[PDB]
Structure formats: C-alpha cells, structure tokens
Amino acid sequence: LIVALTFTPALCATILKQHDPNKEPSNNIFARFFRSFNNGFDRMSHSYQNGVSRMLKGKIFSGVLYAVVVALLVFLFQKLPSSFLPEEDQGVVMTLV
Amino acid sequence: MAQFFIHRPIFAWVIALVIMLAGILTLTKMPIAQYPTIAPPTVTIAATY
Amino acid sequence: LSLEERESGAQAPFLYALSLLIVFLCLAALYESWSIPFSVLLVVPLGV
Numbered sequence A: 001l002i003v004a005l006t007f008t009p010a011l012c013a014t015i016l017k018q019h020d021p022n023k024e025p026s027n028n029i030f031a032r033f034f035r036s037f038n039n040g041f042d043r044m045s046h047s048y049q050n051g052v053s054r055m056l057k058g059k060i061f062s063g064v065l066y067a068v069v070v071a072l073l074v075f076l077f078q079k080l081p082s083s084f085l086p087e088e089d090q091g092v093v094m095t096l097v
Numbered sequence B: 001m002a003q004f005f006i007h008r009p010i011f012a013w014v015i016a017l018v019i020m021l022a023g024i025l026t027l028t029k030m031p032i033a034q035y036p037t038i039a040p041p042t043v044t045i046a047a048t049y
Numbered sequence C: 001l002s003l004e005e006r007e008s009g010a011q012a013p014f015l016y017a018l019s020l021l022i023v024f025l026c027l028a029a030l031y032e033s034w035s036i037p038f039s040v041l042l043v044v045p046l047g048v
C-alpha cells in the first residue's frame, strides 16, 4: 500500500512517456502479436457478457447450479483425511535391530 | 501524499533504496529453521552404577 | 587482545563504507540531486 502511494506514482511521473496522436503503428512480429491479442480479448469480453446475461435471465438454473456447487464442496470436505503436517523424505533412515 | 513524491522522485528513490538496503542487511543475519516453533526445554540427568 | 584484533579485522572499513553510502543517500534526498552531494562529501579530508 505505502509503495503504491509513494514510489510508483513518482516512477510513473518520471518513467512514462507522453502519448502521440499520430500514425505510428509499425507492423512487426513483436508488435502485431499485441494487436491480435487485443482483438481476441475484446470479442471474448462480448462472449462473457452474453453468458452473464443468459445466467441472469435463468434464475432457477443459476440457483440450482450454486446449490450443487456448495453440496459438492461439503461432500468432498469429508473425503480428504486430516493430519498435522505432511511426511517429507529427509534423506536418512534409522534401523533398529 | 502522492503529490509530495510525484515532484520529488529522487526522494522517493532514496526511501526505496534505504528500505532495500535494510532488508538485505537483515537477511545476512536472520536465523534459518524449518519451522517457526521453538522446542520447549528439556533437562537430562545421567548417572552410572 | 590479539585474538580480538583478528576477529575485529575488516569491520571498520565495511562499517565506514555503509556510513558513507547512507550519507550520500541522505544528502541526495535533501538536495534532490545525484551529483550535488559530492561537493559536500569532498570536505571530509579538510577537518582530519
């Protein structure tokens, strides 16, 4: 928190460079990757929004899904056994005779 | 306040550097154990007949 | 004392390097400059 309040704002003031409203996109293997990634993520966001809308309209379906989720959680909580600490190989063996 | 250090970048750098130096110095002297717990005392008495 | 000396060797120069570093850093914080502190630092010989 403190670092974000003091050190990073100074770093941004000092180290960030002013934006330029000019036709300076250079097509490059290193560069075009980012444009393609941005387009893909932009449409993926639309897909997510559509899924959210269908979730909101379907009250019963969302309710039952969440109920099943909590039920599966509680069912699996029992299945794991419980111990204080794990057993670690420590590279030594003692033998009793 | 953010404004104070926005105008005094060298000051903010110096504070960051001092923190890092203190931490590096600390790391060169810390104890290293597997667990935070420290075992409670034991006293043993030995006699031979 | 001989043993003490052998243990205490190389502490003073290390210790005085740390102090000079921190003095530089504090002077830089005061003047807000990386080059100004050195004028102030150059004065050490004169007193000694």
Ligand SMILES: CCCCCCCCCCCCCCCCCC(=O)OC[C@H](COP(=O)(O)OCCN)OC(=O)CCCCCCCCCCCCCCCCC
Pocket: B015, B018, B019, B021, B022, C026, C029, C030, C031
């Ligand atoms: C391993 C190293 C130790 C690590 C400790 C943990 C990190 C502590 C936090 C970092 C401390 C950084 C210290 C930097 C010193 C800064 C000196 C300075 O020049 O700041 C000036 C500033 C005032 O600035 P301004 O009002 O703008 O005026 C400028 C001119 N117009 O002044 C100010 O705004 C106030 C700044 C604070 C002033 C502190 C005063 C020093 C008091 C020290 C007493 C404690 C000593 C403990 C000794 C222990 C003994 C065993």
